[PDB]
Amino acid sequence: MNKLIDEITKSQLNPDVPSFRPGDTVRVHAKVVEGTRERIQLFEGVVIKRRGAGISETFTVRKISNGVGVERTFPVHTPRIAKLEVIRRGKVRRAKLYYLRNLRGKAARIKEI
Amino acid sequence: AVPFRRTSKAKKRKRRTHVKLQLPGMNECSNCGEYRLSHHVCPECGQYDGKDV
Amino acid sequence: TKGILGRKVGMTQVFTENGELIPVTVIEAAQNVVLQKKTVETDGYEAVQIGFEDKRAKLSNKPEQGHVAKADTTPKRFIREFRDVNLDEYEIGAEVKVDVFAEGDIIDATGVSKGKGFQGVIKRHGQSRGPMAHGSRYHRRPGSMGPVAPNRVFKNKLLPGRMGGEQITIQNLEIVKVDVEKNVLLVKGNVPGAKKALVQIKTATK
Amino acid sequence: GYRKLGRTSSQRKALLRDLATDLIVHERIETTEARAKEIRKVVEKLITSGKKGDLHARRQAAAFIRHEVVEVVQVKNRPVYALQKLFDDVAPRYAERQGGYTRILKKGPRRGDGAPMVIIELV
Amino acid sequence: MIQQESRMKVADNSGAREVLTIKVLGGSGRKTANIGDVVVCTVKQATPGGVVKKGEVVKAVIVRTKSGARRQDGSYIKFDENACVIIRDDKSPRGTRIFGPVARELRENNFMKIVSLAPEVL
RNA sequence: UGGCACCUCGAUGUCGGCUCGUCGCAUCCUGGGGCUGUAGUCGGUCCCAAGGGUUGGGCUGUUCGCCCAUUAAAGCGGCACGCGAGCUGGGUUCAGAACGUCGUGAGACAGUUCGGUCCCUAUCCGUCGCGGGCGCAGGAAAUUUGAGAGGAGCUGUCCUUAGUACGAGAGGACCGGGAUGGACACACCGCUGGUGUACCAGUUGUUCCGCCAGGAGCAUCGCUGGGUAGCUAUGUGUGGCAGGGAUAAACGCUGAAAGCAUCUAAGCGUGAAGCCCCCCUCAAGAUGAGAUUUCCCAUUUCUUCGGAAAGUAAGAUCCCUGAAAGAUGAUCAGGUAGAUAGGUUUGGAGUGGAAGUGUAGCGAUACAUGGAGCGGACAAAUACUAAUCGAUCGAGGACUUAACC
Ligand SMILES: [Mg+2]
Ligand SMILES: [Mg+2]
Ligand SMILES: [Mg+2]
Ligand SMILES: [Mg+2]
Ligand SMILES: [Mg+2]
Ligand SMILES: [Mg+2]
Ligand SMILES: [Mg+2]
Ligand SMILES: [Mg+2]
Ligand SMILES: [Mg+2]
Ligand SMILES: [Mg+2]
Ligand SMILES: [Mg+2]
Ligand SMILES: [Mg+2]
Ligand SMILES: [Mg+2]
Ligand SMILES: [Mg+2]
Ligand SMILES: [Mg+2]
Ligand SMILES: [Mg+2]
Ligand SMILES: [Mg+2]
Ligand SMILES: [Mg+2]
Ligand SMILES: [Mg+2]
Ligand SMILES: [Mg+2]
Ligand SMILES: [Mg+2]
Ligand SMILES: [Mg+2]
Ligand SMILES: [Mg+2]
Ligand SMILES: [Mg+2]
Ligand SMILES: [Mg+2]
Ligand SMILES: [Mg+2]
Ligand SMILES: [Mg+2]
Ligand SMILES: [Mg+2]
Ligand SMILES: [Mg+2]
Ligand SMILES: [Mg+2]
Ligand SMILES: [Mg+2]
Ligand SMILES: [Mg+2]
Ligand SMILES: [Mg+2]
Ligand SMILES: [Mg+2]
Ligand SMILES: [Zn+2]
C-alpha cells in the first residue's frame, strides 16, 4: 500500500463495474480483438474468487461447457469488458470457492439468497 | 583432521593478538560522584536521569 | 544522452491505448540539481555531477556545505556523476526535471541489488543437488575441487559466501509515462534494489 | 517480525501470558532485555483493551489474562482477580494518556550467565 | 506443462482413446510443451475398429491443458483435463470430429481445420 | 596390447555411476577459403580457426554396444582410467549356503547363483566471503581516472526476394530484408502460483475458567478451508544488437631481381564465430600508493639541534533506538537541531457475518441489529514511552633543486 501509486493509478479505475462477491452468476461481454476484426463473445458462470487491491484486482469465473469445466480469469478494471452483469446472487460461506473444482453437476448447484 | 606440525610460540602469540577484551564504557554520575555505565541506572545513589527509582 | 537520479517507490501496472496490460515501476526524481562540471583541461575527462536529495542542516558537515555553497542550494544526500554527456547544457546550479525524457525513450537502469546474507552454493551459483534417497549422504554440497595433480585448488572455484549487494544495470528498458508535476517516471519492467533504493536513469548506450 | 525467545510457539505464548499478568499485578518486575522488550507491546495492547471498557473487550482480554488472585478484600471475604484490577484500577489511571504506559530501565549483567537485566514498570 | 511420460486423453474421432507422450519437438534440450505444440506420442488405449491402432507411434497437437495460457490483454484460461488431437504430416487432423472446448491459441499456429471442427473455441 | 622391475608392503583405497570441472587439437556443429567426377539442390576432400555449444529414454553392475525418439551437432583424448579426510556400493575381492565340473579325501574353478559393518572435531598451504593495524612527509568529508583482472561471445524455423538465376526435365538457389523460438544468464514480486507455527473461520475427544453462554490447555500447528509482509519459480522484464583496428588461410594491385613474366624482394588493397577494442562488474597496498571540489588552521610547555607531550580545531568514535543490512565485525537510517523503534488514532490486505439482545421454530437451527467483528510483519499522522547525562580520539605540516613565488 502506497499513496503515490494510488494517485497515479486512480485515473484508470473503472467506475462502471457493479458490486459482486464470490458465489454468484455473472455474464461477461468480453471483446475479442482479431488482427482486423472486433467481436464480443459472452462468458457466463459463477465467480470462484476475487483477490487483490487497487487497479491490480482480478476475479475468476467458472463454467462447464461440453462436459469440460473451463475457468477464465479477468482483471477487474480491464477495458476489454464491454459490460458485466450480475444475473443471480448465490449464498456461500467461503471467500474462495475452490471446492467446486472437484464436483460434477447437480452437486455444484448453489442456493440463492 | 589432525595437526601435521606443532605450533611454535611466535605463531601462537600472533594468533592470540586479537583475543583481548575491551574497556567498559563508563563515566561518572553527577549525583553519585563516582563511575557508572552510560544509559544504565547507577547502583549507588539509585537514580537515573536525576530521579530516584 | 541525458540522465537523472531517482528513488524507487514501488511497482504496479497500467493499461495501454491498445488495451494490453503491462507492468511498470514508479520512480520519483524530485529536488536534483547540478553541482559541478568536470572538464578535460582541469580533470582529464568530461562529466557532470548531480546531487539528488536534500537533507537537514544537521547530518551535514562543513566541507560538504562548502561544496554545495560553491553553487546555490542546500546540502544533498546522493551525489553521482554522468559521463558521455554534452556539457554545453547544464548551467551550474540549475535543476533537472523529469521532462528531459519523452514517452517511448529507451533507458538504462543502474542500482544496488537486494541483499542476501551468507548464502549456499545451490542458491548463489545455481548448482545441482545430489540424490536425496537411495542411501545418499550428499545433498547440498559444493562438489569436487579438481584433480590430484596440481596439489592445490584453482581460482574461480565457486563456494558459499555473501550473495547480494552488488551493483547491477539492465539495458534497453522502455519508459511509459512521464508526469512532471508529481516528479514521477513510469518504466516498463523492474529495476534492481529494494524499496527506497537509489536508481540511476540514463539514455541507453546502444 | 516479532521475536522467538528460544522456545516453541506454544511455549512462547505461555511465557508472554505469564509476564503480562505479573506486570499487571505487581506493576514492577525485573526480567532480561529481549523478554521485557517483547512483553511491552502485549501489556500496552491489553491496557488499551481495558481502556475501551466494553464487555466484548473484557472477553478479549479474558482470553489472555491468567486467572489468579491479586488480593482479598473485606466487602465477607471476596478475592479480586487480575482482570478486575485491569478494568477497575489500571485502565482508569491512563484515561487521559494516549500511549506509552510502560518504561524500561537498564540494570546490568546477571552473575550466573551474564544476561543483561532490566526493570520494566507501568507508569 | 507436459513433458515425456505424461498421459493425456485424445479429443477426436480416431481410434486412439489415451496417449502417452514420448518427445517434445522444437529444440535440443526442450522439456515442456503447452497449448498449440506438437508432440511425438504412442497409443496406449484404443477403441476397437478404429483407424489408429494400439502401440502406434504418432505425432499430435495439444488442445487443452490443466494450466492454460495468458493473453496479451492480461486474461487467463485454464481447463480441467489434458487433451490431444492426432494430426497428419501437415496440420490436418486424422479424425473427423472433435469433442469439448478448444483454446483460441490454435488460430495463431494455423490449426484452422481443428478450430473449425471444434464445438466451442474459447 | 606388451617388455623392465626404478619409488611406495612401519598400508600410495581398487571398477562403474553422482557433484564439480579444467586443459590439448589430430574439429562433431557454427565462421572464412582452395580443388571438385563444382549446371542447380544435396555433397566429398583439404587449409585457417579451441570463441561458445555438443539430448531424453529401453536392456545390462556394466565402460562399451544394440535399439526408440529428437537435434545445428549428438567430437576424440589428458588431468593417480581427474575427482570416496566430496557421495553411493550394483561389481570385483573375507567368513554362510547351493549347482555343473575336477580330486580317494580335506577342498578347488578369473564357471554360476542368494546374502554380506565404507572410521576422522581441519594445524599449515590452497579456494570462497568478511574484519582489524599501519602505510601513502599536515589533519579531514565526498566525487572519481584507470594500469591490470574477471563475466558474456551459442543457435533453429517461417515469410519475401522467387518458382527468380540454373537446368531437357525433374527439381531448385547464394547474397539481402522481416517475424518468431530452443537452451543459458541477470534482476524483480505488479500478474499466475508455492510457503507463510503471534492472521481469519469450521470441527472431534478430554481437562480447566464454580454453572449456562462465551473461552482456554493438550492431542503432528489436533485436523480441515483460506491467507498479509517477507523468501520464491514453474511467473514477469531484459541480454548475447549494430559495429571499429590489425591479422590467419586465401584472393589481388603496382613491381624489379631475370628489357618478358611474376601476389614479394621494397610498397599497397580486401579478408574469419578467432586477436585487441565496443558491452557488464572489481580495481591506487597500481609501496609506481594517482586526480578534482570543499573544510580546519599555524597554540602551550620541556628539550643538547634532532625531537618529545598536551589541550584542541575541521572530523570521527564510545554508548543508545533500529533495518532497506547482517553469523560476529562491517554497512546504512536516527539520538530531543528528533518520526529511529514501540504505543495511540485513522486506513489497507485477509477472513468472512463477532459478543449481547430480539424474532420464528418443540428442537437442531435460521434471520435482523451489520460488508459485522477480528485483523504479525503493510501506509499516514502523533513526542505519549526509550534514544538522558557524559567521555575518548584527532594538525601545526623534513630536506634539495627549478620556474618563480
Ligand atoms: Mg478481497
Ligand atoms: Mg559512488
Ligand atoms: Mg539424509
Ligand atoms: Mg606446486
Ligand atoms: Mg501444541
Ligand atoms: Mg636388476
Ligand atoms: Mg608412514
Ligand atoms: Mg588445425
Ligand atoms: Mg569446401
Ligand atoms: Mg571451441
Ligand atoms: Mg519399464
Ligand atoms: Mg580414477
Ligand atoms: Mg594408465
Ligand atoms: Mg595414463
Ligand atoms: Mg581424495
Ligand atoms: Mg569434515
Ligand atoms: Mg567323485
Ligand atoms: Mg537380507
Ligand atoms: Mg583496511
Ligand atoms: Mg584495463
Ligand atoms: Mg517443385
Ligand atoms: Mg507473488
Ligand atoms: Mg458450555
Ligand atoms: Mg493440561
Ligand atoms: Mg494450514
Ligand atoms: Mg487426518
Ligand atoms: Mg555481434
Ligand atoms: Mg579490416
Ligand atoms: Mg589519493
Ligand atoms: Mg518499516
Ligand atoms: Mg551517527
Ligand atoms: Mg512510531
Ligand atoms: Mg450473525
Ligand atoms: Mg420460540
Ligand atoms: Zn548516581
Which positions on chain F have an atom < 7 Å from some protein CB?
A: 18-22, 54-56, 68-74, 79-80, 82-83, 85-89, 120-131, 140-146, 150-151, 181-193, 197-198, 209, 214-219, 221-222, 225-229, 231-232, 234-242, 279-282, 291-296, 314-316, 318-320, 322-327, 333-335, 337-339, 342-345, 347-356, 371, 373-374, 376-380, 382, 384-391
What's the D33 CA to ligand 32 centre distance in angstroms? 20
Query: Are β-strands E7-10 and E83-86 bridged in parallel, bridged antiparallel, or unpaired?
Result: parallel
Amino acid in the structure at residue E121: V
DSSP string, E50-87: -SSPTT-EEEEEE---SS-EE-TTS-EEE-SS-EEEEB
Find the largest Cα–Cα distance for chain C. 72
Report in angstroms the alpha-carbon separations of B49 from B39, D37, E121.
9, 20, 79
Helix (H) or strand (E) run with residue D74 in it:
strand D69-74
* Total Cβ atoms within 10 A of residue A61: 21
Using DSSP's 3-state secondary structure scheme, residue D53 falls into coil
Q: State the burial class of residue D42 (Cβ atoms within 10 Å of its Cβ: 0-12, 13-18, 19+).
A: middle
Question: How many CB pairs below 8 Å do chains A and C form together?
Answer: 38
Give the ligand with the smallest distance to the CA of B40.
Answer: 35
Distance from CA of A37 to the nearest CA of E (A): 14
Contact A56 C13 (CB under 8 A): yes
Q: What backbone torsions phi and psi does residue A67 show, to the nearest 5 degrees?
A: 85, -30
- What separation, in Å, do the N-terminal and C-terminal C-alpha atoms of chain D show? 27
Bridge partner residues of B51 (DSSP): B48
Residue E86: HSE in the Cβ half-sphere, 13 Å Cα cutoff: 27
The C-alpha cell of C186 is what? 513510469
Residues E20-56: b if buried by 16+ CB within 10 A, e if exposed: ebeebeeeeeeeebebbbbbebebeebeeebebebee
For residue C124, the 8-state DSSP code is H
Q: For residue A52, what is the nearest residue in chain C, using CA coordinates?
A: C12
Burial of E69 (0-12, 13-18, 19+ CB in 10 A): middle
**Apex CA D113: angle with CA D110 and CA D116, to 5°?**
45
Cα dist from A64 to A22, C32, D69, E100, E120, whole Å: 17, 58, 63, 10, 12
| Alpha helix positions (H), chain A | 3-9
How many angstroms separate the CA atoms of E10 and D37, rounded? 64
Distance CA C161, CA A15 (A): 52
Centre a 10 Å sphere on the Cβ of residue C200 and count the other Cβ atoms it contains. Answer: 21
**Contact predicate E86/E93, CB 8 Å:** yes
The beta strands (E) that lie in chain C are given as 3-15, 21-28, 33-38, 47-51, 79-83, 106-112, 118-119, 161-162, 167-179, 184-188, 198-203
As a whole number of angstroms, the distance between CA E32 and CA B35 comes to 73
- Kindly tell me the number of DSSP H helices and DSSP E strands found in chain C: 3, 11
> Cα separation of C50 and C90, whole Å?
10
Task: Measure the CA–CA gap between E121 and C201, rounded to whole angstroms.
Answer: 45
* Domain assignments of chain E as residue spans, ordered by start: 1-122
Interface test with D, best of B40, B44, B47, B52 (most D CBs within 10 A): B40
End-to-end CA distance of chain C: 11
> Which residues in chain E have Cβ-Cβ distances shorter than 8 Å to A69?
79-80
| C-beta atoms surrounding C49 within 10 Å | 18
* CA contacts within 13 A on the Cβ side of E77: 20
From the list D110, D96, D90, the residue with the least C-alpha distance to D33 is D110
C28 closest CA partner among C54, C11, C8, C48: C8
Query: At a CB cut-off of 8 Å and minimum separation 6, what does A89 contact?
Result: A24, A112, A113
The helix (H) or strand (E) run that includes residue D45 is: helix D33-52
φ/ψ of C13, rounded to 5, equals -140, 155
State the SS3 of A8-27. Answer: HHHHHCCCCCCCCCCCCEEE
C203 Cβ contact list (under 8 Å, min separation 6): C1, C2, C3, C105, C106, C107, C108
What method did the depositors use to determine the structure? Answer: cryo-EM
C-alpha A51/C-alpha A22 separation (Å) is: 10
Cell of E121: 473455441
Task: Tell me how far CA of residue E16 lies from CA of A1, B16, C10, E46, in angstroms.
Answer: 54, 79, 52, 4
Q: Which cell goes with C199? A: 536508481
Q: Are C154 and C146 in contact (CB under 8 A)?
A: yes
Rounded Cα distance between E121 and E114, Å, is: 10
Burial bucket for residue A38 (CB in 10 Å: 0-12, 13-18, 19+): exposed
Query: What gap in Å lies between CA B28 and CA B37, rounded to an integer?
Result: 8
Question: Could you tell me the three cell numbers for E56?
Answer: 502406434
- C1' of F398 to CA of E7 (Å): 89
Residue E6 corresponds to which cell in the numbers above? 505424461
Q: Which residue has the cell 497515479?
A: A8
Q: How many CB atoms lie within 10 A of CB C86?
A: 10
Do strands E83-86 and E76-78 pair parallel, antiparallel, or not at all (unpaired)? unpaired
In the DSSP assignment, the letter for residue A40 is: E
CA distance C47 to C80: 10
* Distant-in-sequence, close-in-space partners of C63: CB < 8 Å, separation ≥ 6: none
Is C111 a known ligand-binding residue?
no
Q: Are E79 and E67 in contact (CB under 8 A)?
A: no
| Angle CA A102–A105–A107, to nearest 5 | 70
DSSP symbol at B23: P
The total of other beta-carbon atoms located within 10 Å of residue B32's CB is: 14
Q: Are C24 and C11 in contact (CB under 8 A)?
A: yes
Whole-angstrom Cα distance, residue E79 to residue E83?
Answer: 10
C-beta atoms of C184 and A78 within 8 A: no
Which phi and psi angles does D121 have, rounded to 5°? -140, 160
Q: How many residues does chain B have?
A: 53
Give me the amino acid identity at E78: K
Resolution of the PDB structure in angstroms: 3.1
Helix axes D33-52, D55-62, angle to 10 degrees: 160
Identify which of C153, C159, C165 has the alpha carbon closest to the alpha carbon of residue C124. Answer: C159
What span, in angstroms and rounded, lies between the C-alpha atoms of C34 and C90?
A: 7
Nearest to D108 by CA among B36, A22, A44: B36
Partners of residue D119 in chain B, C-beta under 8 Å: 41, 53
Q: Which residue is nearest to nucleotide F140 (CA to C1')?
A: C63
For residue B43, list chain D residues with Cβ-Cβ distance below 8 A. 108
Neighbours of B35 (CB within 10 A): 12
C-alpha cell of C104? 517511448
* A82 lies within 8 A of chain E by CB: no
